[PDB]
Nucleic acid binder design. Sequence first.
RNA 1: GAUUACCCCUUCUACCUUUUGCAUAAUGGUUUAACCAGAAAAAAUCUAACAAAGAGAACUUUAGCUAGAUACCCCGAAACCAGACGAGCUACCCAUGAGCAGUUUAAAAGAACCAACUCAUCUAUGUGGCAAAAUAGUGAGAAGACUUGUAGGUAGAGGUGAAAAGCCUAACGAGCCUGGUGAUAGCUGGUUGUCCGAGAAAGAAUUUUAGUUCAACCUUAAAAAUACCCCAAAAAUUCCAAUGUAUUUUUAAGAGAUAGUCUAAAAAGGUACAGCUUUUUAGAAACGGAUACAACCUUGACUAGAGAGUAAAUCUUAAUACACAUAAUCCCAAAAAA
RNA 2: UUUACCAAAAACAUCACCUCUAGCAUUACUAGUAUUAGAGGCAAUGCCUGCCCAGUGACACCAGUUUAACGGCCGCGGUAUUCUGACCGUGCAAAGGUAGCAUAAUCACUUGUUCUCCAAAUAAGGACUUGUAUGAAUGGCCACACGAGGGUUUUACUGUCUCUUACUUCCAAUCAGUGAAAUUAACCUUCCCGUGAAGAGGCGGGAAUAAAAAAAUAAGACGAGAAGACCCUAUGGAGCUUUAAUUA
RNA 3: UCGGAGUACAAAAAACCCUCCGAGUGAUUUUAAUCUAGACAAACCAGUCAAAAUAACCCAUCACUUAUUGAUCCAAAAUUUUGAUCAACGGAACAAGUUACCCUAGGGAUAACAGCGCAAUCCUGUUCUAGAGUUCCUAUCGACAAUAGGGUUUACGACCUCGAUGUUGGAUCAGGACACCCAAAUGGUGCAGCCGCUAUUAAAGGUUCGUUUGUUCAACGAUUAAAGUCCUACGUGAUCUGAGUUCAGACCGGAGCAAUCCAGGUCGGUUUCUAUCUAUUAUAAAUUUCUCCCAGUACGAAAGGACAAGAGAAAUGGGACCAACCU
Lengths: 76, 154
Amino acid sequence: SSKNLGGKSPGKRFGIKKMEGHYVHAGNILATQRHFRWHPGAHVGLGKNKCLYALEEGVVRYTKEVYYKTFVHVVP
Amino acid sequence: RVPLVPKVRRERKNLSDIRGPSTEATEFTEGRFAILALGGGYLHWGHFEMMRLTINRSMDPKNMFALWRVPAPFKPITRKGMGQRMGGGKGAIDHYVTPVKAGRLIVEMGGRCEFKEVQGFLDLVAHKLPFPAKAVSXXXXXXXXXXXXXXXXX
RNA sequence: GAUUACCCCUUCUACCUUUUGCAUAAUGGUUUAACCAGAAAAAAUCUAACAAAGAGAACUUUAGCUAGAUACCCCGAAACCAGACGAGCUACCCAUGAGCAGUUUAAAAGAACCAACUCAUCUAUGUGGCAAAAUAGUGAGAAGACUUGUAGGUAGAGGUGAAAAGCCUAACGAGCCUGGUGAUAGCUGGUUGUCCGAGAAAGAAUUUUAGUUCAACCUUAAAAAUACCCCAAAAAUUCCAAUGUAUUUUUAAGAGAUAGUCUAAAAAGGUACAGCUUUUUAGAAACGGAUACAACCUUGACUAGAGAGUAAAUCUUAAUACACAUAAUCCCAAAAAA
RNA sequence: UUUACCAAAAACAUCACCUCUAGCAUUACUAGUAUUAGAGGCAAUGCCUGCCCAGUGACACCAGUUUAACGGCCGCGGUAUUCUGACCGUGCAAAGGUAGCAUAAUCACUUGUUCUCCAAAUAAGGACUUGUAUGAAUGGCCACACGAGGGUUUUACUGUCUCUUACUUCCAAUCAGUGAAAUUAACCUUCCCGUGAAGAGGCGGGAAUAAAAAAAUAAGACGAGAAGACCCUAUGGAGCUUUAAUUA
RNA sequence: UCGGAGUACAAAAAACCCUCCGAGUGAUUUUAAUCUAGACAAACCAGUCAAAAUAACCCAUCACUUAUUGAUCCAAAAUUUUGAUCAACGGAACAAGUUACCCUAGGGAUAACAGCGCAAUCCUGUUCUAGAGUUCCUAUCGACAAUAGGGUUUACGACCUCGAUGUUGGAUCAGGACACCCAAAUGGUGCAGCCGCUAUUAAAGGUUCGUUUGUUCAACGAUUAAAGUCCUACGUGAUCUGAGUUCAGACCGGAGCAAUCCAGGUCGGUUUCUAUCUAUUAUAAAUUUCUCCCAGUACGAAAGGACAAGAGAAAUGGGACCAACCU
């Protein structure tokens, strides 16, 4: 009866795993996102899936800059 | 008046147009007399067209002009075949309707000012609609809004 | 409960099973007696023996080892297979016997009608019967492919069958008896003394949807932690002070649950239908109130007490132009407009 | 002749017709021999049984033959008042329904149209043919006689009926003797309007009512009686059939 | 099975036989060598990011950005990898139908018949007054819409019932509703009169007998004051009927290689029960019609042509009776 056909796609749970003020560790996943919602800041690495991670031990901090970019930093 | 390319999939019923009291089109502008909606509802294309025929047959010979703020319906109506069951895919589109909120101007008329003809005709139109229609002029609408605000403040 | 050494009045919708929900016009039961359905220790918890060793010549062992004590019930098929019993019923056939008035008639065991005998057309009666195939009236064959006695033959991975999926010992899509066998049943119908504490309605999969396997929960017994309600620094929430709180896990064993609904709000389908279906959020299930009635309203649940104070609720509010089908009123009667 | 025990019928059998396989021996056939035996279809008799062998089957061997073997036997366009199309053209196929029959045991539209029958005929009989979806041995068309088969029309006669009435006998009823059965949770067992899993004698509110039988009526107690024979579920069973797969 | 964009508004996730598009890969150049932390997601199993160390140099673009695959055991080019459209995609190495001859275990947790809920559909009363009716909106109609009632149609939902509520029609026996067919009381009429049309009030009574076919129907015949409609489990099978239909046979036609079927048409096909409880085993006063008389007057060119009052006959039916006739 239904001519149209489509499937369902399981969620990959995109989002931010950590928050500002939290104490993280080196190698920990910060934010999993599609394309760029935000940009990597100091002491923060970029992945192939565009997922930002922490390079060294420290504290996560969010900072907005307009020259329109959003950077995430890790302060040891 | 029919949609040029109705290849666009049928729209779901939001019901927010029935609930929402939009003051957007309530602006009186150049029109000396107009029609107001006292309730939310979907206005059929047949209603609008026969309202156009109504305002055409009732046209004042000396000076009259008809202006419709309500655009051609972008929202189709879905109905399954008679005697069928529930589900098994959506049904067939019977016709289109225009969502109408409260305060939206249905019809505005340019021309000379006579209370006798205007009130009566807009009353006939009010009888031709599923929702109560309010014949409106600037002074009456401002006085009704000021009286409603003064009665709500007390 | 009162009340008289008895009764009327007042206060209450059987039990059980199955279910989202049963006094239910869903299930089971005549009553009584009696019979009748949780018997398995590996790892573990616990009580003791000894301890780098335990244990009756066998195994384990960076506190183990040995012993004892703790948790997993019954009934039921339709059928399959094996070995045999069955043609004194019935189907066919073999051997050997017997039977089938009378009338019209040209030679005619020749034709037609009609008793016996062999069949069961129609109607009625009978319907725990006269009888688990009947009786009464009526009807067919009635020298033929006829009827019948006795002695024999053919059986189930078949026989027979003027062939209907019929018959083969009163039910044959494949007999019956015994054995395999306590076959298999994710189903349905069942599973018995007291008291105390805590206390479940949906995450993904499955030749899967009436069943299972670990999460979402829960329970027992110990330890080490801390956890939540969470404002501005920041991205309805996701995080975190403080507050007043108690808990949140970690580990060791052990469960059950996975065919549910309605209201309120936001949606989708449907017709701005449904006690409608498909999702999200929240609530939900004394015996108070709503006439009665699953969620609506009030309240969180000790026993005892001829005490008290309250919550919701109960009887009424709104009007004018010089149409369904048994007996009424939307719970009695009436009333009025703290 | 046939479903013993819901079907007795158009079904099966039957004489007859045809096709096709068997040249052979001593516990079938058969102590038989092509005029015999087995197999299949049809079914007295009467008149007939036309075309197609590309596929399957069968026989001679790779090619062909074989329809009383399994089966198959068309469409469109054009042509004379109207209509119709003897005729012609064309596509396709192995070959495109010949005789006869036909709203039929076949016809959907349908109660086809016309005629007969009747005061009225969806039935029946007789014709017409655009035969959805007849057809020549699963035979075609008729046929005297025959039929506890299936239908239609006049006459005759009737309690069938208008329209029922009376009588007789066996039961029912009474008494006495002997003394069941299924069913049954317990029953103090009313009705109406509403509610309750939506059809209440047990709930609510009104109405009605001292307590118990016998002879009768069958509305209710979703009465009694069969763990629905329809539907669906179970990785149930069994029978039957094959180019399902797998092979003693 | 998988991926993306909405349903699924400012971290996740979230269904429907909801809604749009995409894949089992396609191509161009450089080439992904060894392993140490630490995290995301996650029931199991499969998926992502990656500082840093060592050896040797000094992955990337398009198909919008991501998709574009497969867990065990078993085979092979050879000693390291290549093969299943296991697509029913968490995958029984290997397999299609029929049963109306059926049987068993089950379920109203799930269909058909009826009830119930709903009222799209169905029927009907109304609202507005454009436009017909010569003239004239509303005697009689109501373009297009709007507000409702009803629970007889067709459906939706699957709420009691599958340890059974027996499903059409007819016969029998009724009761009730009013949206009144007739009889009664009226209004308007394009109502002269007689008859009609339309609407209001009213359910007490009545609402026929036949032919064809199973009708629910429909056509037709003869009357009648009329030959109303609906509900009551589309009333009524513990009252009957089996004509229809619900299952064992015999043909035609269609479908299928076949076992066999078809919501198609012709024939045949046993219908079980003794009443336990509740309920029930009548007082009455009527109801309908035709004919005659005034009359063939008023009225009208003609055609035509009563209200009232009076009289005589029946009919249905209530309650009866046997003197005659009749059995």
